[PDB]
Design an enzyme around this catalytic site. Structure first.
Site, short mmCIF file in Angstrom:
data_model
loop_
_atom_site.label_atom_id
_atom_site.label_comp_id
_atom_site.label_asym_id
_atom_site.label_seq_id
_atom_site.Cartn_x
_atom_site.Cartn_y
_atom_site.Cartn_z
N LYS A 1 -17.84 -9.65 68.67
CA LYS A 1 -17.56 -8.49 69.51
C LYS A 1 -16.37 -7.67 69.01
CE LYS A 1 -17.52 -8.93 74.13
NZ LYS A 1 -17.02 -9.13 75.51
N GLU B 1 -7.45 -7.91 81.21
CA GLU B 1 -7.22 -8.53 79.91
C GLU B 1 -6.55 -9.90 80.08
OE1 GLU B 1 -7.54 -8.48 75.71
OE2 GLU B 1 -8.11 -6.80 76.99
N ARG B 2 -7.10 -10.93 79.45
CA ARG B 2 -6.41 -12.22 79.37
C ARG B 2 -5.28 -12.03 78.39
NH1 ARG B 2 -11.84 -13.13 78.63
NH2 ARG B 2 -12.92 -13.88 80.50
#
EC number: 7.1.2.2
Lengths: 46, 458, 480, 466
Positions: free
Chosen positions: B154, B180-181
């Site tokens: 990705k 977002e992590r």
């Protein structure tokens, strides 16, 4: 052997169409359960 | 004017003002706190009191604490200086590099372009990627649903897209991490540095980063897509560019909206979603479009809850999508990269009228021959054997070395122009290269390299 | 200061403004906010007025002045709107300047009762072979277009609009069909591309586009159909004929559900309010055919509904089916196979359209209806070999491209060939190619027969025998 | 005296009175409207204020607007001069033929006939419709319900019954249009003028019409069924005559109630319905009845939301009926019309002591074979009919022929079937299905039994095929 090949081809097709039909029933029920539970919660809170 | 906090309930804060009240959507600045705390007005409650959603944690707040009306919605840095930087939802740098020194600032709430500003021109945004350009092309001003989890390449696809659009067209990119992590936000940043799409030493960076991390309140994660949108809008509306906007994840945009709606006491709709599901989505999505000035095109990673495509979230999002990129594990395990499923990925602009007649025919021919190859996998004649070897060579010619994966592999990455792609697959369908070997078509750029790979290895 | 004619916003923030004062305001009166936004007085309460806001509520603040207009929510109507793109309130959004309309109609006006009406009798021609032959639509009728996303729904409506050019270029106002396209919840780009298409086809000049798009506030999306309908009723009640498309009512219902949940009204099935049926029923009832004493005009409606995965048994789909006079069902599986238009013949119905079909079409289509109904169970012995051979070739005649709707006599000529058995010896894969070659032949050579069928509206024995010879002699001429 | 409007939301209007408060159910008259606007008192809220339900649109109402108490509930014209006429919810002529000069009026609220007034008479009413006559016969003076989802065949069936029953019937008919298509009312009215069951020149009309369709606000849709009932009640009681009452569609009464309940601020019940769903239905349905004083044969079309028969509206309706005809979308899609579910349609007179053992035995025999076919659907859907035992194949072949022989061309549906309508005598229905069950036509093709009248037509049809 021809007849078995034939019948199993059709059975596998019927199974396919049933999988689709059942998956759709599953997901409508899945959504309805969530919606119904929420409406009961909202009604109790109001 | 200066108001006073009268209520704090989680990430919801009520503020009373003595004079004129701040309009809904205005940013308020909480006085006397270590870092910056912005409250966005959501409602006028009456009796001079507004209800706001907090952009950071609300611990330590006292009733009576002073709050300043800024006079506008959240305003963020916009300009060339955003490129290569990471900012948060309120426009603060979070990469520890200092202020983002733009000569303009812009409000994150901005109306979508008006009817008169609309472009009827349907144009392909050439990515230079064979699988995408040929079979599921991107449309300028369009939205593309990016499907697939992780381990399917990705981020490398994303980085190559940024690289290619800047190289081919001259347009920049904006990445909005919605939910977002923090670990993955760090990884992406350093991967972008390695690939060269972010340069820390000069002004050649191709992406601006906007992060709304998972540990931030609902209000922050809900608005961060708008912040990213606003950065992109500058490059379109002020610099006439064809801009790329990445939104990772669109479901987390919806989810944060649901959480905000819940916190404000709004009654949930079907499946627990906000009653404003479709308008929340619409007011955001409609800002992504082709105008007279330019275009913002958006690639949006899609999570499908419960794998249910009829779930309100994906269903509402699908209304705004013009194309799909399906990244597949099956395609990845076959060694084909990018791992884009060539049959599952579709595009609305795959039309003999929009794209060329030459484009449509070849792409339809590639689709047919790949489906017919799958049909012949179950089971050949001279015509069937000819269609099998042609399709296997097509499977390989869909693969591509990426410029972004050059230091990692050593293999020279390729950007393939549109007409070179069309004629490449055209010469395979005609059986002009069925005289030549099969694996000469694996991991190459333009068809001239596949001929040379057969000329060298004979 | 004037608490009778004016008020002040008490609170705002759930799509509804609560306003103090406005003592003389009527139920459902349009009010005006300081910012220039409009609103509808919904809730008259002892201490406040609940106002639905036709725009973004960011533009309304506690303390803002709100003014009576004295008028129940209404919109401009008239011929001045032809060629224009307007928002839900009837304001120009196409940058083409002022709209001259002087008259106005209430958006909520109740549909005509029993007595002002008469049975639908006049053809509303789509120019789409599958529709005009098998699912015929009359002037005054309501006919639902229903199917999954991207199945060709809007395309049905667009070709119908474009089709009317041939009547609208005439001078007989009774044969003309003025069009209204209501976009609800769509992308602005989609609507823009739509008007461009209509303009290129010289159809925009007799069309009004009303647009409340994906980024427009829910109350505007809610309003849009009613506003467009009032613009249509102008024609209906002026002794003329209008066609309205609601594209789409699924998105309108979603918009109304947003409003209703924010008003904290008790939800039911899929969290929709109990009046969601009535939302659509009161709207579509207004498409009607008027008797001669009322001017003889009509309003025809083509509402659009989007299904999830072909499920017509869901709440909103069944609601609208229980309102309209039949449906055109578009099927993903057919669309995927390349069948276009993707109309499921067997599942599509016109409840009142047969009386609104020309005799010419009634003839050749009735036997096609029979020959397809006898084909939908056989799809080898000679008894069923003919039923299959005919059915596949007839199915090929039902295929059609976009943007070229067909004259009724041209439709009667192509269907004539398949029904009488002039395609039986030809292979199914070459029927489409034959049709286009046959059509250019009858247009170029035999205008006298096509003109006579068009005028008489019937195929007489002279016309039948004359047409017999033409198809026979062309079939022998047609080689590859 | 006079009241003043204090609140308006849709159909619900609150009115304050300075002297004397109208009792619940009283009709109030809103002053200054172009057409009569009636408010019906629903509740006393306290502080001299009543909560009311409007019988027409509330647009244009202002707080402070004057309202007068009529001193009675809604009263409507009843008697012979309602025949040939169309009236609305409040008994106004809506046919442009002037005043309805009856000698009497009646309130639309009346109490249900008492237990002592009940008739136990159970006599068969032969319809000529094979499915109905065979399996779930109607009774004279009985309560009949026609259940169906959207588009499955409710109205076509009620129209066929008007064709098959009313002409054979000697008395008056009342048709109440409740929340359905206005254009369906136009069709019915003019077809009755054409046939002469409504005469505009003479006093010979045999039908009274009452309409409150889906263009109406919910107060009107909730009350219009009562208006229809009241007209029928007169003919039943003050004339002691056989009455036919047709209602399309009674679900719309309950749906309208749900809309008003939401505006009344009640805590909602299951599926968002009014907490009063069952009692409201009971108070209305208990008036739709035969008494010792006179006969009402009632036929009510019953809409089924999202095809869900367990929905509180249709689910509560069942127990109010003596015979039920349940339609199925699945059956309609197979091409079987009328789309009656032969295993979900019932009648109180399906009893050997009532219809005779022969009728009863053939009916139960038909249902047994159909149920045996049904509980093989799982295996058939996957593997087809060819996997079954010879025994089960025999039951499948006969059941499929029976399914088809249960279909029938209607005089009313000729445009859709393409066939001339058929009416079959009861004895012929019994005999035909008796012969199929006995295996007398095991050799005949299934399609021969499709869309015919008597069994002889199935024989003739098979002869043309082979």
């Amino acid at each position: 052997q021809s007849a078995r090949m034939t019948a199993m081809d059709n059975a596998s097709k019927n199974a396919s169409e049933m999988i689709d039909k059942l998956t759709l029933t599953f997901n409508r029920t899945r959504q309805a359960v969530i919606t119904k539970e929420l409406i009961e919660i909202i009604s109790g809170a109001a | 004017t200066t108001g006073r906090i009268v209520a704090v309930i989680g990430a919801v804060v009520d503020v009373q003002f003595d004079e004129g009240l701040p309009p809904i959507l205005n940013a308020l600045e909480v006085q006397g706190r270590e870092t910056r705390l912005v409250l966005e007005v959501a409602q006028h409650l009456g009796e001079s009191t507004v209800r706001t959603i907090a952009m950071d944690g609300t611990e330590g707040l006292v009733r009576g604490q002073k709050v300043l009306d800024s006079g506008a919605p959240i305003r963020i840095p916009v300009g060339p200086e955003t490129l290569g930087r990471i900012m948060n939802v309120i426009g603060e740098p979070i990469d520890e590099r200092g202020p983002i020194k733009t000569k303009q600032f812009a409000a994150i709430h901005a109306e979508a372009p008006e009817f008169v500003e609309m472009s009827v021109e349907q144009e392909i945004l050439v990515t230079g990627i064979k699988v995408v350009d040929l079979l599921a092309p991107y449309a300028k001003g369009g939205k593309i649903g990016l499907f697939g989890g992780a381990g399917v390449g990705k981020t490398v696809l994303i980085m190559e897209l940024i690289n290619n659009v800047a190289k081919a067209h001259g347009g920049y990119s904006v990445f909005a991490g919605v939910g977002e992590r923090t670990r993955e936000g760090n990884d992406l940043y350093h991967e972008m540095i390695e690939s060269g799409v972010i340069n820390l030493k000069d002004a050649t960076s191709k992406v601006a980063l906007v992060y709304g991390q998972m540990n931030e309140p609902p209000g922050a994660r809900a608005r961060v897509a708008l912040t990213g949108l606003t950065v992109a809008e500058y490059f379109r509306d002020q610099e006439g560019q064809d801009v790329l906007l990445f939104i990772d994840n669109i479901f987390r945009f919806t989810q944060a909206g649901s959480e905000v709606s819940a916190l404000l006491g709004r009654i949930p709709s079907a499946v627990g979603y906000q009653p404003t599901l479709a308008t929340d989505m619409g007011t955001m999505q409609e800002r992504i479009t082709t105008t007279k000035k330019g275009s913002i095109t958006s690639v949006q990673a899609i999570y499908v809850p419960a794998d249910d495509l009829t779930d309100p979230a994906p269903a509402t999002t699908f209304a705004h999508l013009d194309a799909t990129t399906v990244l597949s594990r099956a395609i990845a395990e076959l060694g084909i990269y990018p791992a884009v499923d060539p049959l599952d990925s579709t595009s609305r602009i795959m039309d003999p009228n929009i794209v060329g007649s030459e484009h449509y025919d070849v792409a339809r021919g590639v689709q047919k021959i790949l489906q017919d190859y799958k049909s012949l996998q179950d089971i050949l004649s001279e015509e069937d054997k000819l269609t099998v070897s042609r399709a296997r060579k097509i499977q390989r010619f869909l693969s591509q070395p990426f410029q972004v994966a050059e230091v990692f592999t050593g293999h020279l990455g390729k950007l393939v122009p549109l007409k070179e792609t069309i004629k490449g697959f055209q010469q395979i369908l005609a059986g002009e290269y069925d005289h030549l070997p099969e694996q000469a078509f694996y991991m190459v750029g333009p068809i001239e390299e596949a001929v040379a790979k057969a000329d060298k290895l004979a | 200061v004037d608490l009778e004619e004016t008020g002040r916003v008490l609170s705002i923030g759930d799509g509804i403004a609560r306003v103090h004062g406005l003592r003389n305001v009527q139920a459902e009166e349009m009010v005006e906010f300081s910012s220039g936004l409009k609103g509808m007085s919904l809730n008259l309460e002892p201490d406040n007025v609940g106002v639905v806001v036709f725009g973004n509520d960011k533009l309304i603040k506690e303390g803002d002045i709100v003014k009576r207009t004295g008028a129940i929510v209404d919109v401009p109507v008239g011929e001045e709107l032809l060629g224009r793109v307007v928002d839900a309130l009837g304001n120009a959004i196409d940058g083409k300047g002022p709209i001259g309309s002087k008259a106005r109609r209430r958006v909520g006006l109740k549909a005509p009762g029993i007595i002002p009406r008469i049975s639908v009798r006049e053809p509303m021609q789509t120019g789409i072979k599958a529709v005009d032959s098998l699912v015929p639509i009359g002037r005054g009728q309501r006919e639902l277009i229903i199917g999954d996303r991207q199945t060709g729904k809007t395309s049905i409506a667009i070709d119908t609009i474009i089709n009317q050019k041939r009547f609208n270029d005439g001078t007989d106002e009774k044969k003309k069909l003025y069009c209204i396209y209501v976009a609800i919840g769509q992308k602005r780009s989609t609507v823009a591309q739509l008007v461009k298409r209509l303009t290129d086809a010289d159809a925009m000049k007799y069309t009004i586009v009303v647009s409340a798009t994906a980024s427009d506030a829910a109350p505007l999306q809610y309003l849009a159909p009613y506003s467009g309908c009032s613009m249509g009723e102008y024609f209906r009640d002026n002794g003329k004929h209008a066609l309205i498309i609601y594209d789409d009512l699924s998105k309108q219902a979603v918009a109304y559900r947003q409003m209703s949940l924010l008003l904290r009204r008790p939800p039911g099935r899929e969290a929709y309010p109990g009046d969601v049926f009535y939302l659509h029923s009161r709207l579509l009832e207004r498409a009607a055919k008027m008797n001669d004493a009322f001017g003889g005009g009509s309003l025809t409606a083509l509402p659009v509904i989007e299904t999830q995965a072909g499920d017509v048994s869901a709440y909103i789909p069944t609601n609208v089916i229980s309102i309209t006079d039949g449906q055109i069902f578009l099927e993903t599986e057919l669309f995927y196979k390349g069948i276009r238009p993707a109309i499921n013949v067997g599942l599509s119905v016109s409840r009142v359209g047969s009386a609104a079909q020309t005799r010419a079409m009634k003839q050749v289509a009735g036997t096609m209806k029979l020959e397809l109904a006898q084909y939908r169970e056989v799809a080898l012995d000679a008894a069923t070999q003919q039923l299959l051979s005919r059915g596949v070739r007839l199915t090929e005649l039902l295929k059609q491209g976009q943007y070229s709707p067909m004259a009724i006599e041209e439709q009667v000529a192509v269907i004539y060939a398949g029904v009488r058995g002039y395609l039986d010896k030809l292979e199914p894969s070459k029927i489409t190619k034959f049709e286009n070659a046959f059509l250019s032949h009858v247009i170029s050579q035999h205008q006298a027969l096509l003109s006579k069928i068009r005028t008489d509206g019937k195929i007489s024995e002279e016309s039948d025998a004359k047409l017999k010879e033409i198809v026979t002699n062309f079939l022998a001429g047609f080689e590859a």
